[PDB]
């Protein structure tokens, strides 16, 4: 409630908020106002919001100095670049003048176009069904452990995102694209109701962006169709994805009978070298498992060939199996541990990969018929 919005703020109080709330913006222009940030002044607070219609990011900035309430929207990139370009310590005075938003500091003056705050989209009202609070580092671990396995544009649209699931005292993430799957769970120190929602892939990426890893805790609220995350002075809200996500419990290989264990770095570097001579599009490599040995081979349409032999721990029947080497490298890069375990069955069945020393995360990769 106010027609003459005005505030004055220190530059260093604005810069990180402006960067954060601009996260959802970018890409194809559609509705003009989506390239703008909503500014609202009231009762000691400046709020800044950016949206792409599917998600929204809000920052709150405490206002010390005399301010007058109101709201407008201004071009996000230009406003950020102006503030960032002012000198360290600058005081930034902002005020609406007619249909222009003025930004003043020193003898620098910028008159920006605006679009009406009344036109700025809102996410529909909704009610929270579960709420819990956890360290940022825990949420970062959960997402980093799994996010590479989300689909991008699968027709199975429930795959273009990440399952967040509460069970007992644990929060779990699951991501799969039909060809590989990642699951990770972490205790969060409170008894939770059971709930399973799919966060869109772009919202996963934005939630990750808001975690600086510091000690401001993450508060999560989940509704039937939305998720909200509060960290520090920021509030992120996203729509959820419809559909029945796959049950990871039924995707984990049943009773794999062949157990190989190898050094993570040695395995990763061998796959990385072999990948060089794999087909650029299909990426297939062949694994041959024999007593205490793994052989990896790759070839390409030019008939070039890579071969790597590694000493490993394996007792069991010999077998051969093909994989997309990118999927294997993605898992090994996410494990970052000393020894890996691969659990195999046969050449046409998935394999489970995990840290030999931890069960918090598990990975499943479906083979290729080479």
């Amino acid at each position: 409630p106010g027609s003459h919005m005005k505030f004055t703020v220190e530059r260093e109080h604005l810069l990180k908020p402006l960067q954060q709330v601009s996260g959802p913006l970018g890409g194809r222009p559609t509705l003009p106002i989506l390239g703008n940030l909503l500014l609202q002044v009231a009762d000691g607070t400046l709020s800044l919001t950016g949206t792409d219609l599917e998600m929204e990011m809000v920052a709150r900035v405490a206002l010390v100095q005399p301010h007058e309430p109101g709201a407008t929207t201004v071009p996000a990139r230009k406003f950020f670049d102006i503030c960032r370009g002012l000198p360290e310590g600058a005081e930034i005075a902002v005020q609406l003048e007619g249909e222009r938003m003025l930004v003043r500091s020193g003898r620098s003056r910028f008159s920006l176009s605006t679009l009406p705050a009344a036109d700025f989209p809102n996410l529909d009202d909704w009610q929270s069904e579960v709420e819990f609070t956890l360290p940022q580092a825990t949420m970062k671990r959960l997402i980093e452990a799994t996010q590479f396995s989300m689909a991008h544009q699968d027709v199975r649209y429930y795959l273009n995102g990440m399952l967040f699931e509460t069970e007992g005292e644990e929060l779990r993430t699951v991501a799969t694209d039909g060809h590989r799957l990642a699951v990770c769970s972490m205790p969060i120190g409170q008894s939770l109701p059971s709930h399973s929602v799919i966060v869109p892939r772009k919202g996963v990426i934005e939630l990750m962006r808001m975690l600086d890893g510091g000690d401001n805790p993450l508060r999560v609220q989940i509704g039937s169709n939305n998720i909200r995350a509060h960290v520090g002075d920021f509030i992120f809200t996203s729509k959820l994805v419809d559909g029945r996500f796959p049950d990871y419990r039924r995707v984990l290989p049943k009773n794999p009978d062949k157990h190989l264990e190898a050094g993570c770095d040695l395995l990763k570097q061998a796959f990385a070298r072999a990948a060089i001579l794999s087909n650029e599009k299909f990426r297939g490599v062949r694994l041959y498992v024999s007593e205490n040995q793994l052989k990896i081979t790759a070839n390409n349409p030019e008939q070039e060939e890579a071969e790597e032999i590694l000493d490993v721990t394996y007792s069991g029947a010999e077998m051969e199996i093909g994989f997309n080497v990118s999927y294997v490298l993605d898992v090994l890069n996410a494990l970052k541990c000393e020894n890996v375990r691969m659990m195999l069955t046969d050449s046409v069945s998935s394999v489970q990969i995990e840290d030999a020393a931890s069960q918090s995360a598990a990975y499943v990769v479906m083979p290729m018929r080479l």
Binding site: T176, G178, H179, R180, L181, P246, V251, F282, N324, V348, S350, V364, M366, P367, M368, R369
Partner: peptide, 5 residues
Amino acid sequence: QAXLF
């Protein structure tokens, strides 16, 4: 490439 489901 095979699928998990």
